[PDB]
Structure of acetyl xylan esterase:
Amino acid sequence: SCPAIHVFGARETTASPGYGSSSTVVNGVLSAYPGSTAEAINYPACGGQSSCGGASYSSSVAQGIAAVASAVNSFNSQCPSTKIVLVGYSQGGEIMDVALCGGGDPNQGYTNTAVQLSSSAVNMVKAAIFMGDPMFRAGLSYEVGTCAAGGFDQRPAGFSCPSAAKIKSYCDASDPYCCNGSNAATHQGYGSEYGSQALAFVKSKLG
C-alpha cells in the first residue's frame, strides 16, 4: 500500500549509507506520525575520499541531484496522494535544494537550471528541511539562522525558489560551509539546535 506520509533523507559527506545527520528530524516525523515511512537517498555523499567511492564533490552532487529526482518522482507516480517531506543535511541539503528549487549548481558544473522534480511531485512535497546547506545565502525568505553571509556554493543575489513557502533552511554565522565562519563544530549541531523548530514547521504543513 501507500502511506499517508513518506519522508526522504539525504546524508552528509562521508557519512555511512542511510540518513546520516538528517536522522534527527527524519525520526521526529516518523514518531510524530505512526504509519508514516521513510527512505534514504542513495548517492555518493562523497568529496573524493576513497571510503565513499572516491567521487569528487562535484560528481557526488551531480549524481545526488539525479538520485533525489528519480526517487521522489518515481515514488510520487506510485503514490500520488501521499504527502512528501524532504530532509537534507549539508551536501544532502544542497542536492535537494537544486532538485526542488532549480537554478543549477554552477560551481559544481551542474548546468541544467530546471527544477528536477515533476510538477506532480512538487505539489505533494509539503515541507523541505535543509541544514548546513552550502548553497545558503542570507536574505532568502525560507532561511533561518544567524548567518548573514553565505556558503561556498551560495545562491546568487535575487534568487527565488518557486517552492519557497515549503522550505526551512538553517545556517549560523560561525559555520565554515553554509556561511563564512570558521567553527566546524557549528556545522555538526543543527540537529539539536533546530530540530524542534524544524518539526514544528513540518507539523504545520502536514496537519
